[PDB]
Design a protein around this ligand. Structure first.
Ligand SMILES: [Mg+2]
Ligand SMILES: [Mg+2]
Lengths: 217, 217
């Protein structure tokens, strides 16, 4: 069920941003910008053939603002990394000022009833990372939940930055790695004109404004 | 991030229903009824003083349908069970045909950074259960997440029925207890006229239609 309390980010992290998919509906990007949202990661693709229905619109509209904007791919355990990379690449244009690409690795559907083997994830995810890093010229970010991190990402992928979900506690990775982004709530608290409780993910960057401005550059 | 895939309930469970709070917005209860939703649990109260802003409206409108309707209390770790029970009781009318009351026990805010001691939860939750069972004349349901169940509910509360959240896997309780309700998704898949992807929790009852009709009676 739902509490009226919210989980907040730690005060030391002042660079905040959102991540969205089509399920967040019609987004007023100028209104998010007015709430000091500094970045957005927008869902583009999933698996080897799916395209989020609002990716095109969100990409165009978010990029009209001053926000730093990137795209994410929702990883599939059931198709090859090469095909998944090709799908993200067909959909997401190269743009020097964009944020680095994100691959989102987490459980979905029934996959947690019979978790994929780590070896099989390493093979396919490593191909994706190689292809995206080469194409966009930027170090790839891996988003994960705690369970997916512990089972697939921990003690691995030193060539990537980590974006960790931690919506109930302060953020920490089980191998003591440092995180680069932290997703701190699924139901971000929002002001301004249409302002209301919304199911939209909120996040912070680890560092300061200057680090932010130079991130992935 | 968000997958376009959904987690579905096992085919053997045919009695489906929803749970909602104000965050689900304006609900067309007749439209849910038209999707074979057989029950609803509606958030009424939280802690010792909070009232969900749509409880009154949802209770009235859902009860106009043929659905079986109950209310839930979102438990606070920071006030007494007696005061929390008194708050649910002031807000939720007694109704013979209603579903039993639910107490929702899960982490929120920062509470998972320093989890409450089991003893302290047993004291306060037991008072709530005693007071609600006496007042409504129905066995109380405890909703919990896996983590809250394992830390507070497991090997305890034999006087209650269990409503377990399991949105990534088939349902099972770590002490091998049988569950009575199972929350299988946070983003239920919805048809009909306003039909769209919605952030609304979907659930199944363990049993058949006749058991359902007699449940809590
Ligand atoms: Mg690692
Ligand atoms: Mg138990």
């Amino acid at each position: 069920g739902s509490s009226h309390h919210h989980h907040h980010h730690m005060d030391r992290y002042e660079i905040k941003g959102v991540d969205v998919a089509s399920y967040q509906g019609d987004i007023d990007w100028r209104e998010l910008e007015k709430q000091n949202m500094k970045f957005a990661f927008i869902k583009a693709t999933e698996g080897s053939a799916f395209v989020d229905k609002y990716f095109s619109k969100n990409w165009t509209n978010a990029n009209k603002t001053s926000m730093r904007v990137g795209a994410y791919h929702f990883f599939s355990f059931d198709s090859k990394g090469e095909t998944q990379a090709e799908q993200f690449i067909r959909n997401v244009p190269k743009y020097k000022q964009a944020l680095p690409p994100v691959i989102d690795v987490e459980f979905y559907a029934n996959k947690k009833d019979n978790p994929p083997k780590r070896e099989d994830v390493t093979k396919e995810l490593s191909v994706m990372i190689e292809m995206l890093e080469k194409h966009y010229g930027k170090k790839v970010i891996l988003y994960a939940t705690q369970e997916a991190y512990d089972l697939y990402i921990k003690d691995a992928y030193p060539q990537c930055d980590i974006w960790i979900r931690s919506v109930l506690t302060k953020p920490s990775l089980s191998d003591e790695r440092k995180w680069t982004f932290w997703q701190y709530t699924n139901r971000g608290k929002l002001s301004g004109y249409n302002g209301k409780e919304k199911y939209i993910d909120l996040n912070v960057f680890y560092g300061n404004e200057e680090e932010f401005e130079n991130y992935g550059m």
